[PDB]
Amino acid sequence: AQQSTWRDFGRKLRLLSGYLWPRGSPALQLVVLICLGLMGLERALNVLVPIFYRNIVNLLTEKAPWNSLAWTVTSYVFLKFLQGGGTGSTGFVSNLRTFLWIRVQQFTSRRVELLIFSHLHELSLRWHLGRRTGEVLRIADRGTSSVTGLLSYLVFNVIPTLADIIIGIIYFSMFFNAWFGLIVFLCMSLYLTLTIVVTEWRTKFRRAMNTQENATRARAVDSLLNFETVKYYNAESYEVERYREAIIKYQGLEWKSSASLVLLNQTQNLVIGLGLLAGSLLCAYFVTEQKLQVGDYVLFGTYIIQLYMPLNWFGTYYRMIQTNFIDMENMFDLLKEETEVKDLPGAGPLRFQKGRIEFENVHFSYADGRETLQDVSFTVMPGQTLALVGPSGAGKSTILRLLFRFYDISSGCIRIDGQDISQVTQASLRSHIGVVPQDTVLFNDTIADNIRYGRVTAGNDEVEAAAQAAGIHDAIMAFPEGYRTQVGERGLKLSGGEKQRVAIARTILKAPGIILLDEATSALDTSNERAIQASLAKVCANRTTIVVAHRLSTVVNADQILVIKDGCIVERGRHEALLSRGGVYADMWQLQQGQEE
Amino acid sequence: AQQSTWRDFGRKLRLLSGYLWPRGSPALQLVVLICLGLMGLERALNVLVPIFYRNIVNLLTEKAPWNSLAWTVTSYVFLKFLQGGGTGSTGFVSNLRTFLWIRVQQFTSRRVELLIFSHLHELSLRWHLGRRTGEVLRIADRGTSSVTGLLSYLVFNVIPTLADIIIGIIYFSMFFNAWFGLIVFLCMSLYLTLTIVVTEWRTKFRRAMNTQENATRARAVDSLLNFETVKYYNAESYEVERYREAIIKYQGLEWKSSASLVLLNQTQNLVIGLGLLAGSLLCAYFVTEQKLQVGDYVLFGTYIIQLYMPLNWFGTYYRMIQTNFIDMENMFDLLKEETEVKDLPGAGPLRFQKGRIEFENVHFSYADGRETLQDVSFTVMPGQTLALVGPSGAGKSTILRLLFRFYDISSGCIRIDGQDISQVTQASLRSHIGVVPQDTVLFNDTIADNIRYGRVTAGNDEVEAAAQAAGIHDAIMAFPEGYRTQVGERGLKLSGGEKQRVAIARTILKAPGIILLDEATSALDTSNERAIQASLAKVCANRTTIVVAHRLSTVVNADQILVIKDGCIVERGRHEALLSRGGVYADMWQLQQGQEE
């Protein structure tokens, strides 16, 4: 229950990383089994090959014919080839183990990254505005690389290194005289303690260096963005002198940081030299003079400096483990709770005998932000043109946003045909109704598979039926590549109303039950819209149509309109009556006829 | 004369990097001398210490008392401590050499970076058009780090490594039998050739991996910025399937890249193993059986794998040398030619008996861009209010920049008092006249040393004389820290006209001869300006004043105005006459009196 690094670490491993591989089950567990087998084989070879080095030295000092030497030295060169030298040539089986490990690394990275990317298509848009999304994608894929590097380094470069230390200290404690193992243990404990102490002494100097670095960069960048000001008042020498003393003090701080780093290197060198100074325990100390051989010296001198080379790399792991742990908690905690979605059981899709919609007393405020609807209730028969054309506040878009189930509002629930919307599922509502946006964004793809996006699986009718029904067969046959023009925004800007008519073509390829015009054009001239409205309102048919606008040449229904004020209806009138009797829309009509010239 | 990497490289070293250190001349050449001495000492120790290893092995196989062994093995541990192990512990004298080298590294980095930063305060914005300065500052400090890393790596990690190779091959060619040196030379030539061939084979795979990486990132980021479009039309599975196959083909390309990298590691391992396979030339090959000792084997087995460990690091140097060379040519060529400045000899500062200014037929166009002045000539007596208040084109703001000597214009040079401006120096003109900008930018500093820039070494009359003469002593005594409020833009936004009145306070602390009131407020209400204009025009005194505006409640001089049209005067009139006779300013006055309500 405490805030530490084993309660959450033990909670996230309760069979969560246990079904990590349920896809390639015949031929993926064999890969990790062969990787563990090669890891154990390499840990065995690291102890096995200096024994053969000692055998070569003992056979040279105790002279033998060439048949007892040639196969021995070729087998030694072979067994050293299987484990490489030191850092150089990285061994024969370790890099092969990484070449086999890269496939399951790609598999687990693909799994966790698709899990994140599939999680970020639920959890609603109310939370869809943190302030940015490039930063959350950057911490997302840094977190995926972080968790795969963390698991790889923790299972490959910490635990096998410690196992090599344990098998070496068992070797020195059992097989020479149980005297060298005390030296190895004290030297390695002193090495690790001095390394972590000078590392935690160095981190604050590095942080001060970074703060002085971005301070002395921010002192210069604003001085050079003010070029006109520095060409004024002829004071360039003062600014270059101040930047001179700023970079002087920055060089002083990073000189302190470099002094800390070379002191770390000096302490590691002093510890490894004092540990290697016990090579004088190979002469006249009941060693090598009475009861040991010649190769027992070179075995020590090879194996001690052999097992100390992975201990150099404790630098640039510890900070990497810290950054990987903070990236793991950032990707684990700050991404996955819930926002709004209620897919409760016992839910039929929808009921669609007609196209009615019904409203009863909606009440919502934007989390005590922008004021919005109150006391709105009306009933629309199947097949009707309805306008929401009041002043440009929040209640206009409010009608457009709410029927699509972005968020719940009040105890009262909306009733489309015969069932409330809080009980039924999401996908039937998102499929049976279809809106027309204010502006259409084409993806970086062709024009033909931007019209495809609603239906799916083309079917070879989108250039034949949808392009002709929108009246755009000429312009889809007026492309240099025929119709496959592979630009959405990285090439030519297409037009203003062309994006709206291709959104209407997408709506035709959706075939909705209730269409919600949502601010039809709002960007270009009305002379194109009033000319091509016979094809724009072809999708306007025997179905419920709800349109919002402010250029009121489109609203010519003359049946009933619902001019809104501050999210509150006070008239619930109609077009001829709001031009005649209840003038609020009439005053807007006077100022609009004054606006037309 | 050819475009290659030695003509310019030999031209930039003709005594340019020869006076690199003329500041710390008593105690900075000793530092680089001790660094070269320690480099030579470490190159000597790398050959010296395996000789003592051979002596230890020969004395152990040819048994001696402990007095002939103990000092020998302690001296060997000492001499190995002075040069470290392999990569581990980095030696005793090399890291000390870098600790002494970091000071002269800071010195040369400070020199070249202050040279760049002092060069970028000269010439004319006839370059101050490069639509980006963050990138040129980024390329600038990357170039400084580039050139210091290039010089350090070239003098420390290439030439001493080659000297170690030469002294080793002289050792093998002179001291064993002149047979092992052929093996070492052939092995190292084969190693370097295979390394550079597989490196140039791998670079194109890395470039293809980077192109597929940013392609598959750009395919996802625009899909997720269109979250409303993907919540529309319920087609999330299609986008995640397309992103699935995109990251599949990206993983295939980077699998090819990783295969190339592990093939490079395999080729290096094969070459070092085939070179080490000549350790079978230490048995029955006129070696170690008739005329050599036991330590001659371990000398070979230590020194061959000793001198091959710097040869591993040819990777991640060659690409670094390429990036450092392209950064060096980017910082060397694309920064320093000239723009405009003419500081020719034979130039008096200025002549300042009065405050006259005189104009004769200016003609300029913005490099065939925006059309500007033609046929403008007039004469202003010392002490006069003059307006340039035509339509908002390019001819209004032409004069302030032009009189301040930003650029030459035509054969007609301007004559301020008795001398043309193309002959005299820059600093006297930039000091004797002072302008008032449209908007004032406060630096990230206190308020008191933002007023202090004009005088230099203000001492403490700026809060007493300048703050009282501008009438701002109350607001400079109304701060929580008294007056030292350490925010310019990172804290509170101060006000609109407060920046203009503190610019007027800076102008008072400049004490100009001719003031150019360039677009006084242009952002806030006129009721503050017309109330505090008695302190705004306190600097308006017995001196030449030139003001530009469009809110014409300020221009009340009624002496002579110079309303401009398309950079051309056709009236050269006055206020009462342009309201009475030559109506162009009168038509502007009619539409402005129609604009006031």
Domains of chain A, residue spans:
178-316, 351-440+511-597, 443-493
CA distance B393 to B372: 9
Contact A21, A28 (CB under 8 A): yes
Which chain B residue lies closest to A218 (C-alpha atoms)?
Answer: B444
Residues in CB range of A471: below 8 A, 6 or more apart: A501, A532, A535
**Residue A188 structure tokens:** 């390695």
Pinpoint the alpha helices (H) of B425-574. Answer: 427-432, 448-451, 467-469, 473-476, 497-508, 526-536
The verdict on a CB contact (< 8 Å) between B255 and A434 is: no
Contact A446/A490 with Cβ under 8 angstroms?
Answer: no
Burial B348-369 (b: 16+ CB within 10 A, else e): eebeeeebbbebeebebeeeee
- Name the minimum distance, in Å, from the CA of A577 to any CA of chain B: 36
Cα separation, B93 vs B86, in Å, equals 14
C-beta atoms of A244 and B98 within 8 A: no
Nearest one of A453, A458, A505, A448 to A481, comparing CA atoms:
A448
- What is the distance between the alpha carbons of residues B133 and B137, in angstroms, rounded to a whole number? 6
| Residue with token string 């971005």 | A214
CA atoms within 13 A on the CB side of B148: 19
SS3 content of chain B, % helix, strand, coil (to 5): 55, 5, 40
CB contact under 8 A, B244 and A510: no
How far is B171 from chain A, CA to nearest CA, in Å?
Answer: 23
Domain spanning B357-439+513-593, CATH architecture? 3-Layer(aba) Sandwich (3.40)
Facing residue for B87 by CB, picked from A219, A277, A312? A312
- Nearest-CB residue to B77 (from A61, A277, A298): A277
C-alpha A378/C-alpha A391 separation (Å) is 20
Q: How far does CA A16 lie from the centroid of its chain? A: 20
Contacts of B66 in chain A (CB under 8 A): 283-284, 289
Phi/psi for B426 (5° steps) reads -90, -45
Contacts with A, B 422-481, CB within 8 Å: 426-427, 430-431, 434-435, 437, 441, 443-444, 453-454, 456
Residue B390 backbone zone (phi > 0: left; psi -120 to 50: alpha; other: beta): beta
Query: Of B74, B82, B298, B439, which to mutate for an interface test with A (greatest number of A Cβ within 10 Å)?
Result: B298
CB contact under 8 A, B95 and A262: yes
Structure tokens at B371: 């059309």
Q: For residue A385, give Cα distances in angstroms to A380, A542, A544, A589, B54.
A: 9, 10, 7, 19, 101
* Distance separating alpha carbons of residues A246 and A225, to the nearest angstrom: 18
Backbone angles phi, psi at B544, to 5 degrees: -75, 125
On whether the CB atoms of residues B462 and B452 are closer than 8 A, the answer is: yes
Phi and psi angles of residue B413, each rounded to the nearest 5 degrees, phi first = -90, 145
Q: Which among A260, A319, A226, A254 has a CA at the least distance from the CA of B145?
A: A254
Residue B536 burial (CB count, 10 A): 23
Q: How far is A318 from chain B, CA to nearest CA, in Å?
A: 17
Backbone angles phi, psi at A358, to 5 degrees: -140, 140
Contact A502, A440 (CB under 8 A): yes
Comparing CA positions, the residue from A141, A330, A110, A144 lying closest to residue B217 is A141
B213 φ, ψ (degrees, to nearest 5): -65, -50
As a CATH number, domain A351-440+511-597 is 3.40.50.300
Q: How many CB pairs under 8 A join A and B?
A: 270
Cα angle value A17/A19/A24 (rounded, 5°) = 125
SS3 B6: coil
The two three-digit tokens of residue A38, written as one number: 């090669």
Q: Residue B265 has which token pair?
A: 């590691």
Is B486 within 8 Å of chain A by CB?
no
The Cα of A578 is separated from the nearest Cα of chain B by a number of Å equal to: 32
Q: For residue A227, list chain B residues with Cβ-Cβ distance below 8 A.
A: 125, 128
**Which of A298, A404, A431 to mutate against chain B (most B CBs within 10 Å)?**
A298
Other CB atoms within 10 A of residue A132 CB: 9
Residue with tokens 């972005």: A406
Cα–Cα distance between A509 and A461 in angstroms, integer?
A: 10
- In this structure, the strands spanning A433-436 and A544-547 are unpaired
| Chain A interface includes B312 (CB < 8 A) | yes
C-beta neighbour count of B136 within 10 angstroms? 16
Q: What are the DSSP calls for B249-284, one per residue?
A: HHHHHHHHHHHHHHHHHHHHHHHHHHHHGGGGGGSS
Q: Is A246 helix (H, G, I), strand (E, B) or coil?
A: helix
How far A580 CA sits from the closest chain B CA (Å)?
33
Q: Which residues of B are annotated as a binding site for ATP?
A: 366, 390-401
Homologous superfamily (CATH) for A178-316: ABC transporter type 1, transmembrane domain (1.20.1560.10)
Residues B297, A60: C-beta atoms closer than 8 Å: yes
Identify the residue among A93, A229, A265 best suited for mutation to test binding to B, counting B beta carbons within 10 A and taking the highest. A265
CB-based contact, A128 to chain B, within 8 Å: yes
- CA torsion, ordered B123, B125, B127, B129, to nearest 10 deg: 170
- Kindly identify which residue of chain B lies nearest to residue A226, measuring between CA atoms: B441
Q: Answer whether B103 sits within 8 Å of A268, measured CB to CB.
A: no
CA distance B153 to B310: 13
Distance CA A85, CA B534 (A): 85
Q: A582 φ, ψ to 5°? A: -90, 70
Residues annotated within the binding site of B are 366, 390-401
Return the H-helix or E-strand segment holding A373. none
Enumerate residues 6+ apart whose C-beta is below 8 A from B82: B42, B45, B91, B92, B93
- Give dist(CA A534, CA A125) in Å, integer: 35
Around Cβ B509, how many Cβ atoms within 10 Å? 21
Asked if A80 lies within 8 A of B276 by C-beta distance, the reply is: yes
Nearest CB partner across the interface for A262, out of B99, B282, B312 = B99
Partners of B479 in the beta sheet?
A: B482
A215 touching chain B per CB within 8 A: no
Q: Which residues contact A362 (CB under 8 A, 6 or more apart)?
A: A373, A374, A376, A377, A402, A409, A410, A412, A414
Experimental method used, please? cryo-EM
Coil, strand or helix at B547: strand
